[PDB]
Design a protein around this nucleic acid. Sequence first.
DNA 1: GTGCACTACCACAAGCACCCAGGTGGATGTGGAGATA
RNA 2: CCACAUCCACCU
DNA 3: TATCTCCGGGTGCTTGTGGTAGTGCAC
Lengths: 97, 1278, 49
Amino acid sequence: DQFRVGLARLARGVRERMLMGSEDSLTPAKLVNSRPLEAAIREFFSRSQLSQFKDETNPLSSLRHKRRISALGPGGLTRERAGFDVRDVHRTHYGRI
Amino acid sequence: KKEVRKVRIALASPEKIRSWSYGEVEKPETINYRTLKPERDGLFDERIFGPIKDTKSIVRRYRMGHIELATPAAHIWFVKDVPSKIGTLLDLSATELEQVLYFSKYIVLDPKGAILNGVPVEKRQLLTDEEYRELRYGKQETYPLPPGVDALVKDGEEVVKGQELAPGVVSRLDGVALYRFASILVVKARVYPFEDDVEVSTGDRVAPGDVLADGGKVKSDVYGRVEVDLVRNVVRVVESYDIDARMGAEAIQQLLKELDLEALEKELLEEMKHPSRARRAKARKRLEVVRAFLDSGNRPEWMILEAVPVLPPDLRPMVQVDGGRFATSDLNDLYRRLINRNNRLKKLLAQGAPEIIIRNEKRMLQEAVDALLDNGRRGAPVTNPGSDRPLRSLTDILSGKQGRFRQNLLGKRVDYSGRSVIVVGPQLKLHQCGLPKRMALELFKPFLLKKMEEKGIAPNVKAARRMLERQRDIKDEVWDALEEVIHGKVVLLNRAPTLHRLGIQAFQPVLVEGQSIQLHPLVCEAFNADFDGDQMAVHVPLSSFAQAEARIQMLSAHNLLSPASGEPLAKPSRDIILGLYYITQVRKEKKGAGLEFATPEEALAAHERGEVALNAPIKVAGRETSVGRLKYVFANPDEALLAVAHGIVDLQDVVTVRYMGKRLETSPGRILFARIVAEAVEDEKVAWELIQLDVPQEKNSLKDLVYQAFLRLGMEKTARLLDALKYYGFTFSTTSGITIGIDDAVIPEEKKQYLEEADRKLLQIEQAYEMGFLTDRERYDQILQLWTETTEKVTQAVFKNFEENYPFNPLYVMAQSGARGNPQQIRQLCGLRGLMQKPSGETFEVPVRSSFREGLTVLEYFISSHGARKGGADTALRTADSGYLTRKLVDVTHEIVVREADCGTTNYISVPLFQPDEVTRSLRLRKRADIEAGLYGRVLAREVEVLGVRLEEGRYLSMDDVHLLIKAAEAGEIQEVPVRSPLTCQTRYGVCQKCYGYDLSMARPVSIGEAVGIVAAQSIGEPGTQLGLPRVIELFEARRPKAKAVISEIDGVVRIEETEEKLSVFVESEGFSKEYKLPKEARLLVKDGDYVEAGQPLTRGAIDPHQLLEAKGPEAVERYLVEEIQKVYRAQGVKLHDKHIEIVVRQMMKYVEVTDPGDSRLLEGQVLEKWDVEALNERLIAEGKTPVAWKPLLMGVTKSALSTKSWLSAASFQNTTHVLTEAAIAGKKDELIGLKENVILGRLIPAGTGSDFVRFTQVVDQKTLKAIEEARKEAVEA
Amino acid sequence: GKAQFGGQRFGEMEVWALEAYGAAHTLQEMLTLKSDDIEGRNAAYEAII
DNA sequence: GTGCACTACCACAAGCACCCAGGTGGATGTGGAGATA
RNA sequence: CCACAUCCACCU
DNA sequence: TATCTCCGGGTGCTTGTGGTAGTGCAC
Ligand SMILES: [Mg+2]
Ligand SMILES: [Zn+2]
């Protein structure tokens, strides 16, 4: 998802460059620039909420941190202050959660 | 030198702003990157705020700047507040008219409006810029004409709609068309030819009847402007007269320039007194604002701001972070933006005047000013793109959960403090705590430096500091000096959640080796501190004044009883209770022979021989005495304990011991406990009479013992008794060997068939459902009832088995004593945890048959996880709700302090002793706990003699008096006790000593100067976290319950009509009848024909406090609130006294609103006591009998807290914006009464030691007193 | 923080407990002398030395 | 003197600003396009 | 220098 | 061409608006 967001930004950039650009033999450089997609990927892998510091206290800690499921995320899905209705477990969690 | 007494807040004139600032900032250049010095005259200029190099830099912390805007602007607070203060001072609509005038292209115009545009005379209407731009200059139309073509209309032709000005040109309205060669100009004007000199020149605007030109020959006919064209020698007069033209905040200023408050006030009075309440509501709403400006000095002319103040640079600093990058507050960005926009506006106004661009720039500047003053009220200006975080404005600094008020009211940081994990301190005394030596050395560093400077450890303090800076220089002499320093000092220990007053406790530190803080076990309940890894903080008071305070009134040895009730908190804990129960228990096993012993005197030898064999045990259940009492008789307790030491008899053995005066058939354990009590205290007779050596020492027995010892002995003796009890409980719990194994969770066999029986019944109900005899709800109720009955049956069977078979079972022993566990937990361990609640709130149909002694099935564990998650979430949220409630109560009640001479209150409350309704119609005595919580520690209103004892008026009710009154009520002498209460106290700010009462941490009556309000609020709020709560919220914050119960307001009789649409209950009286409609769900509780009184609940349900107050009165609603609040706390087992609830209820309704006006408006509500003072001044002190007829108004806790005379507490409590705006409209000289304001200012607290009753107390020793008194008497000559 | 441990919080609940007692000078010095008043804290340090 | 419409008052619905416990430890993050040098 | 944001934990 | 610089959930409140009954004009 983050990669396709960066790809959409790059698509807007290349469309603008083509609109400004006049000639045609400019495919390598004058169309695509790596800055938007690379910036988006780096931002996702650095400052995202789900990309979080590894807990290497012991192998069990690392494994559990690797197999954790979060209802939270970017912010538009689930948020801290009010989540009382969804905190309770469900009858379908049997064997899955 | 003079002391601060009042704090006044008011508006600041532009003259005041210019007086504050030292020069003006013009450049939006904060600081150059290359030159770290300030760049120019901008936000950090050197000469505008003071020297940045070491006067110190502190001048830059206080010197302010200013920006002189070329265009006036209005404070966002006075235009966007919910009552728009500018919008209510003027006759302008707040929501749309004010802002469309204040931002958009709209015009308001006072002076001239006589011009006609299809609308009558204009006074202050709001009209769009288009129609005003038209009526400014008449009605103008322009028509280009092709060259070389001559039109048919000449220069002076009147034209109507439809006239052909040319073969292709036609106009649309009546006017005059001027022709050129090369265009057509259609004007709505009247043309007059003339041939003489002009009287009115070009530019002047004229009124009808005035001479235009040619003398009296030509005169004006309508309003408009005169234009003279000598080409045809004609004067044209348009129908647009001189009318003002103003826009933006400047326009508003003109309004505020021309508004006079006295005439507006008189007009408001005249137009408010006559009409009904509909108009007079808003009339008084704006009249209060007008009076606020009029009486407070500062005029509203400067209510909008011309010069914007600029905060000192250090209050908005730019700091290097790393590699030259600057971190800056949003204040600098907002100031830079405002400066740049103002400079652009000045330049644009200087160069040229393109009207539309100028207007856009004016709107932009106004938006920038508003964003600087407060961000978020209109749009959301943000930082540089890429970081969508809104800028932080002045309001964000002020308001918010983390704002200037909530960081200075608290003192968030302390110098001499530390924190560490806590461990048990069993070897410590109750007035001692274990402090690690490294943190103790660090905390007492200056004292240690002084002490080692006193001796020869170091030459000077610098040498001592460099000696102590590295731990490799530590020496035994340093440790000895540190021990000498802290010989008498005390430290304050604190737990992170400070729920009540006992969360802070003083202790005498003892140096220990380690990293953890050693804590006495007995204070494990005063703090909510176990030893599972929690940490506690330590603080070190410095001044000898504070040291004396901490050692006297905050030492843990002096705080043994609760402030919420009389129950002690230093009671023996779980392990001590277990040990004392084990030592003071009597065992009985079996009787195997003829128990008959009273009659036969030869039976002694026969039964001794039987005990020699296995016929009868030593603790045999004989008729009169056991063989143990016969075999062993001890002259003294020492002999019995020495025989126990030899293993002959256990501590749990019945035996005859000759005590000081009697022969007792008791156990050596009970005798040893009695001796422990007798040696802990000095005298033994009192110790013997304050114990009960005939029962096992359960936790209630220990609590009663501690309370009696505190009452009859004092402070030191109670502490020593507690220490001895703790030590012996530890020793005997250790030696007794209580262990828990899987076999200790004994499963009774009978419960087995119980399940079978239930199962059979279950099956029956099942088939009862398959025959159609029951519904789903009926079946669910039957299953729930059956399972909840068999659960109780299994619990009873389990406890009966434990009593009968294994008296010394660890689970049963812990359950009987107050050590740990509940019968429900013991059942879950050994019986069954049947019923489990569904997440929807209901309960599962299928129970859990197994227990933890057995193995739970996977499904049962998955079901119990539901309850586990529910409990976790409920804790994690109800804690927050309880904290919010506690903050509300503390802020509303913080002003109550007992400062008093005994008020002459001939008023009281009659506390009932009988429950008015436990059945439909019956009276029974209230529970002992409720009566104790209502009566203990009160002051009798008047003398009462109930059982031949004269309880004199003004006597504090001790526990013995409460017991005597309860016994008398049981006998049937009295039903209500008249006692003083805070609810009837006449003290100005607080309650008096008599009306408050007698319950404290001590027993003695309350000392004068104690802040009873805060301790009351803490006592109410502390159990909330361990708690229902929404009911408490809706009672404290007066609201309308959803399930409202209909009540009657006038006495009468009940006439019930059962119409199927809606039941009709009629309150019938002699001259009138009232009717009430009750729906199907309205389940009432009255019978037809019964007499009904005012306020009597016709239906079952919650009662709205407001209508109850309107019906019965203040006292009735106060009693209802107190009882309802106490009900929920009783339901949870919490023992909370009524004094605190009465304090909060009195603070809840301390407001009245007058009906017959005196010297003020009518429909306004303020303090009851102020109105009482005004009435006393008006009727008696001064001449003029003007009754200020008021009615009491009941408002919630939040509303009462917000509406207060002192603006500091209200601003710091809930909402800074509205409170500060209200306190700025009228200069609010905040008198420094109340503890919150003094905390804000940091001065001495009016309560406690700072009370003027004890604030100053001259102290002189005997010899100096004798010398000065000798001087006095020698001044008295001869 | 990294340089020195930093002071312990005193919040408002601790303030409420402290003024629930009669302690007024303790609160006065712990809000001004030991917390904020720079001249006060400097003078107190010098006097204690 | 009564039938009719009228206009001021009231219960109900909608838009809006404001609340949402205390304390501690640790970790990582804070620029991309235009314009002028 | 410690500002703010985000995340993970610990004690209630 | 390089570097620097510009490009929500819940509660109290207010207001509104059609509803509703007192009262003004016509039968
Ligand atoms: Mg703990
Ligand atoms: Zn009193």
